[PDB]
Amino acid sequence: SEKAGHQTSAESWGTGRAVARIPRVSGGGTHRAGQGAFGNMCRSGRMFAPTKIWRKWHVKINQGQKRFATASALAASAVAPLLMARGHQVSTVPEVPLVVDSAAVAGDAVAKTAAAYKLLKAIGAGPDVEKVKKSKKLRAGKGKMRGRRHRQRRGPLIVYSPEHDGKELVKGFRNIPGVETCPVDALNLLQLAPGGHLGRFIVWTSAAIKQLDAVYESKKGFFLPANIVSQADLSRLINSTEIQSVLRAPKGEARTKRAC
Amino acid sequence: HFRKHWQRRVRCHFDQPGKKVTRRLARRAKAAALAPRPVDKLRPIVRCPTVKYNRRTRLGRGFTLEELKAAGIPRLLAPTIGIAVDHRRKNLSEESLAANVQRLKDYKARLILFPRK
Amino acid sequence: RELQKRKRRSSRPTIRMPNRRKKALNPAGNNIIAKSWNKKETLSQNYTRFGLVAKLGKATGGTAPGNKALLSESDAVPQQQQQENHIRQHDLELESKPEVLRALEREATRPVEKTVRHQSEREREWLQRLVDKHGDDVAAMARDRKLNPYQQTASDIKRRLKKAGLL
Amino acid sequence: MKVRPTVSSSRRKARKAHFSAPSSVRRVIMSAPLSKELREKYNVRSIPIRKGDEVQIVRGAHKDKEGKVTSVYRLKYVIHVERVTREKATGQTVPIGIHPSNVVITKLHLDKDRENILARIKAGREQVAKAKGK
RNA sequence: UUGACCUCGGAUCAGGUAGGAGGACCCGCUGAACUUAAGCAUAUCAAUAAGCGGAGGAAAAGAAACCAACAGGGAUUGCCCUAGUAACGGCGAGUGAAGCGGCAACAGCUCAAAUUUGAAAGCUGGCUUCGGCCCGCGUUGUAAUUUGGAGAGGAUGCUUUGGGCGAGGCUCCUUCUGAGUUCCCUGGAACGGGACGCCACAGAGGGUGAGAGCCCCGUAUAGUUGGAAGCCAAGCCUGUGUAAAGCUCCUUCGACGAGUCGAGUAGUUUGGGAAUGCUGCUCAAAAUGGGAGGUAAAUUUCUUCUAAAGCUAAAUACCGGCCAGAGACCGAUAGCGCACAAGUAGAGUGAUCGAAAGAUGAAAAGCACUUUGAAAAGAGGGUUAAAUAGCACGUGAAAUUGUUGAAAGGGAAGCGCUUGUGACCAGACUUGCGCCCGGCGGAUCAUCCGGUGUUCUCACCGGUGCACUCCGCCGGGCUCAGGCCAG
RNA sequence: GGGACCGAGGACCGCGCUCUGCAAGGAUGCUGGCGUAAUGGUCACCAGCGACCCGUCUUGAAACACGGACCAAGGAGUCAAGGUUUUGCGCGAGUGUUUGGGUGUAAAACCCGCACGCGUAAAGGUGAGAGCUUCGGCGCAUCAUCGACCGAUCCUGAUGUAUUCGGAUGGAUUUGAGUAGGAGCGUUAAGCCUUGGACCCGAAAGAUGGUGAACUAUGCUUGAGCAUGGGGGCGAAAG
RNA sequence: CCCACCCAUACCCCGCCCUCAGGGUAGAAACGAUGCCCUGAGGAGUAGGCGGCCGUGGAGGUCAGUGACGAAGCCUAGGGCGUGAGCCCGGGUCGAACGGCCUCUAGUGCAGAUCUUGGUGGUAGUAGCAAAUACUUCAAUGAGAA
RNA sequence: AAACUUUCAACAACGGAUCUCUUGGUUCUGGCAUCGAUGAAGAACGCAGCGAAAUGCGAUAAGUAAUGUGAAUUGCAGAAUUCCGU
């Protein structure tokens, strides 16, 4: 409140008495009377630099940098080490992009939540939906009193095509803990890289993989960025026949014997 | 430029997502009342005044009386079929006239009218 | 503020205002639009299904893919090419598709009721008295004063005679 | 999760409403499950308790103790059961509070309004099962 | 003498209305200082605060005496940009627009100026059998017609109607709608752990004796029972009077707001000496008129609007009213002054000033009874999982204090380095591997059989056996390696 | 010959020598002791030596002045707008989606129609010079030196001229934030500056609107007001 | 004038810490190339400038993290780690939630301000019985009954 | 030798920090528009067996009528008042 600590009539006692020159409230019949006021040092006073509505809460990020970051999160989701570095129990699925047939998800086939559970267990997402269930834990701190009472892990993100699969699949996966649903036209970085850590487990559908070329072509003002490195395997760059043929003889070993 | 009390007269816009929902609901509320009709009335094609924007062209306020009579739309019927009418504007050239009686003729081709009772 | 603290301590119940709106959001009735309007699709999405135009102005933003709702001269005459001083004043003489649009076209082209106005009983007596004196001479009927008190031209009397079947 | 805007996920508003509730809506809160025999006959799961209901305690230190309701104390969210009592210092026996969620109703106290309650739950449970089945 | 008309009064005559509150946001009036300019007066502060008047759910504004100089725009309002530009400036401090452009929202009208004059056609009241009768207002003007990008009146010919019911539908309240209290352990109490299930368009939230989707309320979804008031409306009854309405054409007409513009002057105000606007004073207009612009272009050539009467939704504001949902907020010296008796207790003549103060336990089971004795107190004894949780009550820090034990001391001692003595506490490498002989048992041994899964050559079971091989176990024998400190 | 202190490193590699191995690029061998205690810690006390007020703020000096009874909790360079420098990042002569529209699992995310802000636009020689090289030579960036072109004013004064107008050609010992083959836009982080309460606390004043203004007698004016500011009272200060 | 001896944070040799510098390290290393190895030199410090690291409230991800068979807090003449701010464990108490790591965020770290609020001391059972109020008791004023 | 003072430890006090909790605050967003001469806002006086530094109500006074629900109220007294029922 802008009036916090200002609802008092306090005047300083000046240089006369042997007290610290802090404003003290008037009156003479109450415990409040004579106490210091109007200061950050004072009990029931005003805090230093009071918090204001016009703090900068929202951050502007360029659309090119948002689409670069989404392109990197999608690419990291196709890498199997980065899935398990992100905490996903991914040791049972038989292909790390994990494209499921759209005919098994389209329409009312997954609209029941029991049928959505059965599909995830068949394709190998079973340990991941059980990881989040077993990780239900009360929150450490005062966020419990503010509406944030439990913390669980994240499960697989199902990416679908609203044009060819419909929205009935969203309702079947909505109650299963951890698992999240996202259309292929509206991919979200907060869901692709939760916590800023890359490598989300994604359960694609066959209609979404067809659309993935199209949705990234239709983005105006953006193209798929060119890497500054063509071959990112550095061991191939250094331990190649072309590089190693031209090098000087090694001037020493990894460990140098002490001379004196 | 903070010589006066800018603290007491600062306005934030945290209702920006909330006002957009209301504005889109007002357009949906309007289209519930005018269910087969379009939400907005037809407007004419006019040239921007100054020398800076002479080459550009925008939507005006309403159709001139000469534009309506040339198209074949009576004046007293046009507000009741979705055509905005401006009595202040004049034509002043045949290029402004011919562009708008083509627009009204194109409106009539795409218009379907239902009888009164 | 000091009012709100009184209600927190009082035993009187809080009066919960129901979520009411001045304007309804969704069309209702037995007509074509109300029986095919989906509650969960937008205005643009619904009019796309109908085949109708929602906004007649120019685009204020990028639209979703698939949306169709938000769209010899001797005298040098710039209007001769766009041709096809009195006009009809009340109607307009006009000239694979969606089912709602085809249904609305059957409503537009549906044949209507004529609802022919009739002459009043005293008006027929006034006109029949004029035939019974002058026959078919419209000039003398207009020029007559006793049987034509409100002096009307022969052109007006002839139209009223042709409506009443008395030639 | 919650969908409707009138629903609130506030712990503060929920705890205020529970502990400042009128006795009319305290009655619905003060409700108990029916037995296996009563579930398979009335097709009803849970009704509020009244005074005449023979009941069985299935949670707490007084487990597997059966009796009739003696009092429905709505102010402290307590039912009292016959012969479920403790002695004070003076020796006077006082009723022990069991919450209605810790008991299972064995025999109902049936009057005309109670059969109407039991019919309305059975009508809704039959309707949705038919709607889900066909 | 009587009766009007006008004007001014009376009435405890009949019917109405205003005051006050609230005032976050809105419309007017009035109006200040400090400060800055490192002094200070113009200026700034600030057309702000305080004071006064008046409204609403919005208000205000509003359908050009406008913007423009264009190939033109076209009521009002708000956002972005114009733009810290133009402009004005003790040219210091600084102050500071607007047009264009992209948007949001869009809606247009009512009078006065006329002769209904072949018919005051209009309206308030009263009495009313509710059907239609009287009084009065009013010609110093109440209806209809018209409102200047118009219109009137004729003529001509096409095109348009008006009332009353009204099934049903939308909004909002309500009724009902999934699944474990299955077995074991800890526990005072499972809501914890382990095993086996079930529901999920419902794993939001809360309660329940400890972390509960399936114990309870709710929550999701479509339905479903009853009801309220607005609005729409399929259809169905009637309509009517030579009634109203739109356009066309023209040897006929076409009225447009005055102590108001404007001129001088004073105050105020603005970026704005065509005063930017307003107000006061003195004088005081026009009709091929008036206003504001444009232009050196050769004379005020041209351009664009019509002032002094009025109404009107939307887009905009909102520290207040009726509610509702939220949060990377605070967590009882915090967060509103007030989580609780809080504008309370208390102080002041008064205007006003204005605190402190949350937590037993799952449940009061809130200590029966005996015995001290004068008490907000003990000793027994009891409740409870616990009373070193006993309405001084969760945890219970430090300052400070008492009792018990050890040691020291006499204006000492305290801190740094280094031993010594006493007291208490701790307890060093966790202490092993390898060979040989005999017996027993399993195998990854057997070119043994059968089966399963697989990455398709690798794994795992089931049954056979001990010729070979390899592991274990038991009973003997032997050797080696071991942490630290000394000499 | 006697004594003290020390033993760093951890397969071999080297220099060497008195060469079957050595004292040569850093300590091994042998013997003993160690669990009712090897070896440490804490407190108390004795002992030898040393020192014996902290923060601020001055001084040649703190031996000045200010603050300090103790303990708990609270407590002071923050946030906006705008400049500027540097780092990271995207795009690049362009850049910026987020006023707004569309959409959505709904204050999120995703998409963009016209504008708009800022910016860009409206090739020379020689010599050094990083790097390359067919070892002959090419030569980045940048610097220096002479040139080239644009504008300006001066004089020189062409075809021409409307007959009183012109600037062509030639040069300047002149100029510019001149051109000479773009480098910017957006964003994140840090530092500094301006303005706001502006790191926290601390004047005397000035203004606006209100509350109170006790008693006594006399005179004057229109019940009230004015005055004797009288007579009393409150406070001030002199150890 | 001569001889021998005593000790500084000075000089010489050795060990260890850190900084700076030079060198080595890929058909990869017997250790996160932001790693590892070899060598040399140097170390005071106010205003000031720069780097790393420790700790607190809250937010996202994660540890299939800890927990009524006892979380957090607190006490502690005990065992450790770090140069240090700090971190870990044991013993007791206690009864419901909490922590490590990578990022994000801030109302984030106290000995002072004649600081604020609270609690408690010495002075001191002293000066004192003045104001102030606490309890007991006693008078009066006005009513009664025995 | 007592006492007195100091330090440390155990136990016992004082005090209410720390941890945990939260029917409170703060901030944002959304739907809607409703005081008064038909006497408002505010100020008193009263109404319950024991009651306020509460709340409700107005001589019909912790309330009456009407509708819905369907078996209580509760700190103790106390109600032949109500349970297939206006």
Q: Which two tokens stand for residue B28?
A: 């949906």
Which chain D residues touch A178 with a CB distance below 8 Å? none
Method: cryo-EM
CA D60 / C1′ E187 distance in Å:
12
CB contact under 8 A, B39 and C43: yes
What would the DSSP string read from start to end of A148-188? --EE-----EEEE-TTTT-SHHHHHSSSSSS-EEEETTS--
A113-123 helix and A126-134 helix, angle to the nearest 10 degrees: 120
On whether any CB of chain C is under 8 Å from the CB of B82, the answer is: yes
B-chain residue closest to C35, CA distance: B35
Beta bridge partners of A205: A100
d(CA B117, CA C90): 14
Please tell me the distance in Å from B69's CA to the nearest CA on chain A: 44
d(CA D4, CA B68): 50
B16-33 helix and C43-50 helix, angle to the nearest 10 degrees: 30
Nucleotides of chain E within 7 Å of a protein C-beta? 44-48, 64, 67-75, 84, 94-96, 100-109, 149-150, 155-161, 167-173, 175-179, 181-182, 188-191, 199-209, 211-212, 215-223, 232-234, 239-243, 246-249, 304-305, 314-327, 329-331, 333-338, 342-343, 345-348, 352-356, 362-369, 381-385
- Strand G near-CB residues (< 7 Å), A 42-71: 42-43, 47, 49, 51
Q: Which two tokens stand for residue A248?
A: 């000087």
C154-164 helix and C121-134 helix, angle to the nearest 10 degrees: 110
Mutate to test the interface with B, among A54, A55, A56, A60 (most CBs of B within 10 A): A54
- Strand F near-CB residues (< 7 Å), A 65-84: 65-68, 70
**What are the C-alpha distances in Å from B19 to residues B23, B26, C40, D77?**
6, 10, 20, 45
DSSP state of A97: S
Please tell me the distance in Å from B20's CA to the nearest CA on chain A: 17
Please tell me the distance in Å from B4's CA to the nearest CA on chain A: 18
Nearest CB partner across the interface for B32, out of C24, C104, C112: C24
d(CA C144, CA C130): 9
CA A27 / C1′ F213 distance in Å:
22
Q: Is B44 exposed, middle or buried (0-12, 13-18, 19+ CB in 10 A)?
A: buried
Please tell me the distance in Å from A54's CA to the nearest CA on chain B: 7
Q: Is C73 exposed, middle or buried (0-12, 13-18, 19+ CB in 10 A)?
A: exposed
- Closest nucleotide (C1' vs CA) to A4 is E336
CA D11 / C1′ E207 distance in Å:
12
Q: Which two tokens stand for residue B103?
A: 């627009």
The residue count of chain B comes to 117
Which chain A residues touch B14 with a CB distance below 8 Å? 53
- Check: CB of residue C132 under 8 Å from CB of residue C81: no
Nearest CB partner across the interface for B35, out of C27, C108, C112: C27
Closest CA to D46 of D57, D31, D60: D31
B-C interface (Cβ pairs under 8 Å ≥ 3): yes
**What are the C-alpha distances in Å from A180 to residues A134, A172, A174, A177, D70?**
17, 11, 7, 8, 51
CB contact under 8 A, B31 and C27: yes
Beta strands in D58-102 (DSSP E): 65-73, 78-81, 85-87, 93-95
Element containing residue A240 per DSSP (H, E) = none
DSSP state of D101: G
Residue ranges of the alpha helices (H) in chain C?
Answer: 2-9, 43-50, 99-108, 121-134, 138-143, 154-164
CA D24 / C1′ E189 distance in Å:
29
CB contact under 8 A, B31 and C108: no
- Matching residue, tokens 């990112």: A232
Element containing residue D107 per DSSP (H, E) = strand D103-107
The residue count of chain A comes to 260
Is A39 near strand F, with its CB below 7 A from some atom of it?
A: yes
**Mind spelling out the 3-state secondary structure of chain B?**
CCCCCCCCCCCCCCCHHHHHHHHHHHHHHHHHHCCCCCCCCECCEEECCCCCCCCCEEECCCECHHHHHHHCCCCCCHHHCCECECCCCCCCCHHHHHHHHHHHHHHHHCCCCCCCC
On whether any CB of chain C is under 8 Å from the CB of B60, the answer is: no
Nucleotides of chain H within 7 Å of a protein C-beta? 20-34, 54-57, 68-75, 83-85
d(CA A183, CA B117): 47
d(CA B111, CA D117): 58
DSSP state of D34: B
Please tell me the distance in Å from B72's CA to the nearest CA on chain C: 7
Please tell me the distance in Å from A141's CA to the nearest CA on chain D: 16
> Which of A:124-153 have CB within 8 Å of D?
145, 147, 149
> Which of C:126-155 have CB within 8 Å of B?
none
The residue count of chain C comes to 167
DSSP state of D98: B
First-residue to last-residue Cα distance in chain A? 74
